[PDB]
Structures are given as C-alpha cells and as structure tokens.
Amino acid sequence: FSSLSRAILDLVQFFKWKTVTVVYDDSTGLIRLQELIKAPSRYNLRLKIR
Amino acid sequence: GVAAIFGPSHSSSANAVQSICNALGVPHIQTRWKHQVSDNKDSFYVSLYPD
Fold first, then answer.
1. Which of A27, A34, A35, B51 has the fewest CB atoms within 10 Å distance of its CB?
2. How many CA atoms lie within 13 A of A38 on its CB side?
3. Mutate to test the interface with B, among A24, A27, A30, A31 (most CBs of B within 10 A)
4. Where in or outside the cell (chain A)?
5. Which residues pair with A21 in a beta bridge?
6. Main-chain dihedrals φ then ψ at residue B17, nearest 5 degrees
C-alpha cells in the first residue's frame, strides 16, 4: 500500500476532484491509505475521513 | 512457575506473549499502548496505559 495508495491518488487527480470522503472499516485501514491522507498537505484535496 | 507477566512492552512482542498468557491462563499486565485488532478474542490481559 505504498504503491496502491499512490495509484488511488492518481485517480483523484485524473478525475480532478477536490472533496473526497475516504471510508474505511477497521483501524488498520488508516495505515493502508496514509499516502492518501497526507495529500491535502501538498495538493488541493479536502479529506473527510469516516 | 509465575503468577503474572508484566509485558514485553512492544506491539510486535506483546501480541506474541498475550496469546501465550491467554492459552496457559496466567494474566498478562500491559503498561504500554498496543494496536488491539477487532477480532482478537482474548480475555487474560489488562492495559494500564490510557487508551
């Protein structure tokens, strides 16, 4: 998930999004998507984690 | 022959000692935080570090 989190981040820029709503199921899923959560630090996304 | 095991104090090591202490019956007293997965059916452990 160092590569899968960069692949999901390429689809939220090819589709030109600004507000995503990342939904996981268990607490390990934050580690599986930590390259997507750190994205508003440099890009123009707006995360709402549920 | 012991009565309690006071933790190896690390997330990769405490999960291995917890499943031993759950098996043999002896309590396992933890003093640090540990990622406890949702389907870990263990009962012989306490954690004194604040959740």
1. B51
2. 8
3. A27
4. Cell membrane; Postsynaptic cell membrane
5. none
6. -80, -30
User: Nearest CA of chain A to the CA of B40: how many Å?
Assistant: 13
Contact list in B for residue A27 (CB cut-off 8 A) is: 35, 38
Question: Per DSSP, which regions of B7-51 are E strands?
Answer: 29-30, 46-47
Resolution expressed in Å: 3.5
Cβ separation B35–A28 shorter than 8 A:
yes
Q: Which amino acid is at A46?
A: R
Q: Does A25 touch chain B (CB under 8 A)?
A: no
Position of tokens 């580690």? A31
Tokens 């190896």 found at: B8
Method for structure elucidation? cryo-EM
